[PDB]
Structure 1
Amino acid sequence: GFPIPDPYVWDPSFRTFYSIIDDEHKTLFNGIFHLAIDDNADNLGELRRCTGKHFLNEQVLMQASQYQFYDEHKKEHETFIHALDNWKGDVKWAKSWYVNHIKTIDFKYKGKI
């Protein structure tokens, strides 16, 4: 499936064409990047802040045009957040979860919010 970039960086293939959402995704990629390089509390903290913030803003933009698939996308966001709140050290899974998230879940909203 979806190739996990390496180095774990955001590439134009992730584009939603929503400049704001795009730039936040870039910062999130950077978050996990360091996470895999040192699973520590500070990196997790930085990523955890960045994630939840971005996850809320995207839900905000979705709710603003009453996005049809808001709930499923919100359930999704809750999942990765729960994961981050009960970390087991699985960086690979986060890497693949995050990529598959933008490409199959975020992508559903392109042209709709």
Structure 2
Amino acid sequence: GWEIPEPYVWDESFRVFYEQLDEEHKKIFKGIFDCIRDNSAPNLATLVKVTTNHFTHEEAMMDAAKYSEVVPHKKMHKDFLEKIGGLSAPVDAKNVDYCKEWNVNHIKGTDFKYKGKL
């Protein structure tokens, strides 16, 4: 799987070259980093909010582009929001690692498929 950054921050190897989506990816790294250091109910709900907003915006750009790999991508999105929308603070160590892993793997293994296609 790809390297999990420590400290958990965004870096350039995650760039997709669509400014607003890259800003949103940066905020999801920050959302998870904040949950890790302050595992609170506000921080978890912020992570749910920023991730939902990002997934709606990324899916709106894939649909506008008639990007042909949008439906398995949308299911990936739906499953992750279902997972973190069901969590409650403090998130245990296993689910924190799940989120860390999932965000890295999702950007590089699935969002990278739309590079230059949106």
TM-score between the two structures when normalised by the length of structure 1 = 0.96
Aligned length: 113
80, 101, 107: which one aligns with 2:106: 101
Instruction: Report whether the alignment pairs 1:112 with 2:117.
Output: yes
Question: Displacement of 1:37 after TM fit?
Answer: 1.9
The residue that corresponds to 1:70 in the other structure is 70
The residue that corresponds to 2:37 in the other structure is 37
Instruction: Report whether the alignment pairs 1:14 with 2:14.
Output: yes
TM-score between the two structures when normalised by the length of structure 2 = 0.92
Moved segments of 4+, more than 2 Å: none
- Give the distance between the partners of 1:81 and 1:33, measured in 2 at CA: 18
Report the secondary structure of 2:87's partner residue. coil
Segments of structure 1 that go 5 or more residues without pairing to the other structure are none
Question: Displacement of 1:75 after TM fit?
Answer: 0.2
Segments of structure 2 that go 5 or more residues without pairing to the other structure are none
Give the residue type in structure 2 aligned to 1:63: D
The residue that corresponds to 1:92 in the other structure is 97
Instruction: Report whether the alignment pairs 1:57 with 2:57.
Output: yes
| Deviation digits for residues 50-72 of structure 1 (CA, Å, limit 9, x no counterpart) | 00000000000000011100000
Question: Displacement of 1:39 after TM fit?
Answer: 2.5
Identity over the aligned pairs, expressed in percent? 47
- Give the distance between the partners of 1:65 and 1:2, measured in 2 at CA: 28
